[PDB]
Amino acid sequence: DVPVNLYRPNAPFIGKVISNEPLVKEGGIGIVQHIKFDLTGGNLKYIEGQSIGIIPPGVDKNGEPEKLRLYSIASTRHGDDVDDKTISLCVRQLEYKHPESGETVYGVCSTYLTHIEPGSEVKITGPVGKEMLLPDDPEANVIMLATGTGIAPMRTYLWRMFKDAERAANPEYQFKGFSWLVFGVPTTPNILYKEELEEIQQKYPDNFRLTYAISREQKNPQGGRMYIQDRVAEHADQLWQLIKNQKTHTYICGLRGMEEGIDAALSAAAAKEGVTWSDYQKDLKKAGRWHVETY
Ligand SMILES: Cc1cc2nc3c(=O)[nH]c(=O)nc-3n(C[C@H](O)[C@H](O)[C@H](O)COP(=O)(O)OP(=O)(O)OC[C@H]3O[C@@H](n4cnc5c(N)ncnc54)[C@H](O)[C@@H]3O)c2cc1C
Q: Which atom of ligand 1 is nearest to the CA of 152?
């Protein structure tokens, strides 16, 4: 049932950019773009929580053709316009140090994508991934722990759950469980999809909780910048109590480095009831209820 590898890098789907729109507001750190691609003319189908590959143009420093980079699909299966014709990505421009004055390095594929024009043709592969799939059970609980562009799979879940047009398009999935997004970004301008996440919470105050960790605007109890692991620690007992439910699924997505703190917080919660979290978590992973995609 799950679509996988309908296109492969030896013969990718050539899609066209429909739109490329900024998600970081003025005063935010960095560049994150919402990029929508036209899928008409091919048969690329996908579901929520999957990824696609993008093959950037050009050669690397060794004169070899650039390989695909993976990006989490940011739209539901129907695409943003609920027409089954498009796919969207949430792409941050990678840029970093190499310790010289002004000398910034820009990532190949992410710079290509964040600056791409509508009408441009792009090499797309996939979809891939079966580790971040959403349960069909409408009564499932869904905990979402995201930093930065790790919001992307979370958006596909929340849009399927809560967008009016999605609910109209998916008679079989009328979500009535509880979902909780804890979302970590450096600033309020950097809150990707802020308006829509908050509109969802206002519509569905009993089915959706939104928690932010904004590092440059908030401090944890120890005086440090507020990160997602601090919010998990702050709510560790509630999160553990939700996780004990047989129908609760947890999803963790974003750049690597978040998991150690999340585990330490949940380990302290579970230990209060004589449970060793690492063991409970192993069984949760085996059961398909602990989902991680960090990069
Ligand atoms: C499953 C999956 C899903 C992903 N989803 C998304 C998504 O939704 N959105 C998104 O923006 N990205 C996503 N990523 C990451 C994405 O695939 C690319 O790795 C990223 O966009 C950078 O690619 P690039 O071509 O821009 O960089 P490259 O040009 O390959 O640059 C990256 C290389 O430079 C180095 N480098 C990177 N950062 C630093 C640093 N701080 N200091 C020193 N050296 C460094 C490393 O050698 C790294 O291999 C995902 C990755 C995976 C594996």
A: 8
Six token digits for residue 280: 């409970």
**Solved how?**
X-ray
Domain 129-295 class in CATH: alpha beta
Known binding-site positions for FAD: 69-72, 90-92, 96, 108-110, 149
* d(CA 103, ligand 1 centre) in Å: 18
Residues of the chain with CATH 2.40.30.10: 1-128
Which atom of ligand 1 has the smallest separation from the CA of 56? Answer: 25
Q: For the domain 1-128, what is the CATH superfamily, name and number?
A: Translation factors (2.40.30.10)
Instruction: Give the distance (Å) from ligand 1 centre to CA of residue 94.
Output: 6
